[PDB]
Amino acid sequence: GKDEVALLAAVTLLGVLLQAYFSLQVISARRAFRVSPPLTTGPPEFERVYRAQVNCSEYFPLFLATLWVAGIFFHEGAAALCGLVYLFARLRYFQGYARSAQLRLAPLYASARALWLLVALAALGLLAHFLPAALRAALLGRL
Amino acid sequence: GKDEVALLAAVTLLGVLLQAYFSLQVISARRAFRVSPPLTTGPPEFERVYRAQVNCSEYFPLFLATLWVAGIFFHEGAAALCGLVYLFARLRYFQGYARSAQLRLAPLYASARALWLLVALAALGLLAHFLPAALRAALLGRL
Amino acid sequence: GKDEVALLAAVTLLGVLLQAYFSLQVISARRAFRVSPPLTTGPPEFERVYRAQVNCSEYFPLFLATLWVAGIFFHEGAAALCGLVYLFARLRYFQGYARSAQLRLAPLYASARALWLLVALAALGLLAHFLPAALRAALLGRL
Numbered sequence: 305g306k307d308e309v310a311l312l313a314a315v316t317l318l319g320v321l322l323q324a325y326f327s328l329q330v331i332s333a334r335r336a337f338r339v340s341p342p343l344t345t346g347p348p349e350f351e352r353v354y355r356a357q358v359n360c361s362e363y364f365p366l367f368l369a370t371l372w373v374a375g376i377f378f379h380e381g382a383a384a385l386c387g388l389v390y391l392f393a394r395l396r397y398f399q400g401y402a403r404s405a406q407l408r409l410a411p412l413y414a415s416a417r418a419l420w421l422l423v424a425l426a427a428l429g430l431l432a433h434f435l436p437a438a439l440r441a442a443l444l445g446r447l
Numbered sequence: 448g449k450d451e452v453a454l455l456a457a458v459t460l461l462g463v464l465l466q467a468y469f470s471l472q473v474i475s476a477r478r479a480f481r482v483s484p485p486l487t488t489g490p491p492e493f494e495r496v497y498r499a500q501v502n503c504s505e506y507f508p509l510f511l512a513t514l515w516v517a518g519i520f521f522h523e524g525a526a527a528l529c530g531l532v533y534l535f536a537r538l539r540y541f542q543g544y545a546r547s548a549q550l551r552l553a554p555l556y557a558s559a560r561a562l563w564l565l566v567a568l569a570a571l572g573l574l575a576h577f578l579p580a581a582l583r584a585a586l587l588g589r590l
Numbered sequence: 591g592k593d594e595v596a597l598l599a600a601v602t603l604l605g606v607l608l609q610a611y612f613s614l615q616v617i618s619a620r621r622a623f624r625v626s627p628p629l630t631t632g633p634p635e636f637e638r639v640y641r642a643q644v645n646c647s648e649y650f651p652l653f654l655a656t657l658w659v660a661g662i663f664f665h666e667g668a669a670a671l672c673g674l675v676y677l678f679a680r681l682r683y684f685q686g687y688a689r690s691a692q693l694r695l696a697p698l699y700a701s702a703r704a705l706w707l708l709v710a711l712a713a714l715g716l717l718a719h720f721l722p723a724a725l726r727a728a729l730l731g732r733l
């Protein structure tokens with residue numbers, strides 16, 4: 305029961321730590337630009353490091369939801385692979401935005417690809433779950 | 448094991464796609480008002496479309512947590528129904544805010560109703576889980 | 591199957607309600623300072639109550655992910671205990687920030703401790719899951 309989800313649990317834990325890294329990066333930018341909380345505004349660089357964090361934070365439950373649904377209704381290893389791709393693309397996203405708001409686009413689109421890939425695999429897993437029973441009951445109309 | 452959660456997995460996937468739609472709406476408003484990232488400020492309409500997104504993003508894990516706990520400790524179909532009600536109310540919430548910050552209140556309160564409904568069903572499911580064992584051990588004090 | 595997760599389901603439901611309380615607190619501060627949505631800016635007190643909410647909202651899925659992974663791969667009761675510690679530290683965090691942005695640091699670091707504690711227990715639970723099979727297959731190289 306726990307073995308069939310252990311790769312998804314590993315990839316989830318990686319995602320949590322990746323978010324702890326992003327929080328450390330924003331904490332470090334708060335000292336590197338003297339931005340006192342509750343302020344979110346500063347130079348065109350504090351805002352970029354900070355927004356990259358804010359975005360990744362928002363997108364994290366979308367990642368968790370898809371990783372777990374794709375991992376349980378389609379291959380767990382396949383879902384764990386896109387889960388690693390997404391997370392890695394996010395490090396690049398953050399690192400790119402932390403430079404210019406342009407250098408974030410390419411790893412942002414890489415993150416999108418992995419997110420749609422998980423959505424498709426979750427969709428195909430649920431389709432393959434409900435469709436045969438539907439096709440069976442639908443064709444059960446002949447009488 | 449996966450059949451008893453397949454409706455919750457479906458409703459979760461709907462929620463993920465609803466969030467992808469909200470992100471597309473904010474991306475479209477960024478071009479329709481020339482709002483360059485990392486800026487979140489613009490006309491009284493870019494901010495509304497953008498805030499509606501920000502709010503739905505925040506409330507998504509609350510929806511996921513409740514949908515799954517209510518779906519596992521009370522009827523899965525019942526939880527999947529409020530889960531559909533909440534998500535539908537959110538589309539209206541977004542669409543209302545995307546007009547005026549007043550026209551969002553009614554579908555916002557509809558979303559709240561569905562959220563409290565899931566909380567109650569999760570609460571009743573856990574109550575019915577722990578209470579009989581408590582009542583039994585408590586009454587086991589007579590000696 | 592549901593009994594071995596019932597404490598994590600309880601602690602999750604507590605977290606959801608704690609977030610509903612934080613939303614009520616921000617709604618009350620919006621009337622107590624006449625801050626019309628979609629504005630997030632006001633006195634040095636509306637922003638603090640509001641930011642405390644925004645932060646807790648962000649950190650909630652990190653809490654959920656860790657609580658559930660630690661609860662399933664290490665003791666459920668132990669994970670449910672740190673889960674209660676984290677949530678309680680968050681009430682103090684909110685209440686401290688709602689006063690000064692300094693009085694939030696101590697319950698913020700208390701919240702961090704509980705978060706790293708869950709991460710370690712999830713890590714130890716997965717380590718103990720994968721490591722024996724690895725050590726076995728690795729030592730299986732003698733031939």
Ligand SMILES: O=C(/C=C/c1ccccc1)N1CCC2(CCCC(=O)N2c2ccc(Cl)c(F)c2)CC1
Nearest residue numbers: 320323324325326327328652698701702705706709
């Ligand atoms: O030492 C750190 C930085 C750690 C780090 C980050 C990136 C790369 C390498 C090391 N921090 C303190 C606690 C920290 C913020 C303050 C509140 C909090 O809950 N935190 C938290 C605790 C546990 C978890 Cl698993 C989590 F995701 C968040 C994170 C940053």
Ligand SMILES: O=C(/C=C/c1ccccc1)N1CCC2(CCCC(=O)N2c2ccc(Cl)c(F)c2)CC1
Nearest residue numbers: 366412415416419420423463466467468469470471
């Ligand atoms: O084409 C789209 C729009 C799709 C759409 C939206 C509403 C209605 C109809 C179609 N987008 C690109 C990728 C998008 C943002 C960029 C990063 C990212 O992760 N994305 C993401 C990818 C997959 C998932 Cl399932 C997700 F939730 C988010 C979403 C918007």
Ligand SMILES: O=C(/C=C/c1ccccc1)N1CCC2(CCCC(=O)N2c2ccc(Cl)c(F)c2)CC1
Nearest residue numbers: 509555558559562563566606609610611612613614
């Ligand atoms: O009466 C309340 C306040 C309740 C409260 C808060 C703290 C302590 C004691 C009582 N509110 C209305 C609905 C509320 C916001 C509007 C939209 C929404 O979804 N909401 C929501 C509904 C259900 C859940 Cl379980 C949730 F987390 C959020 C929360 C605040």
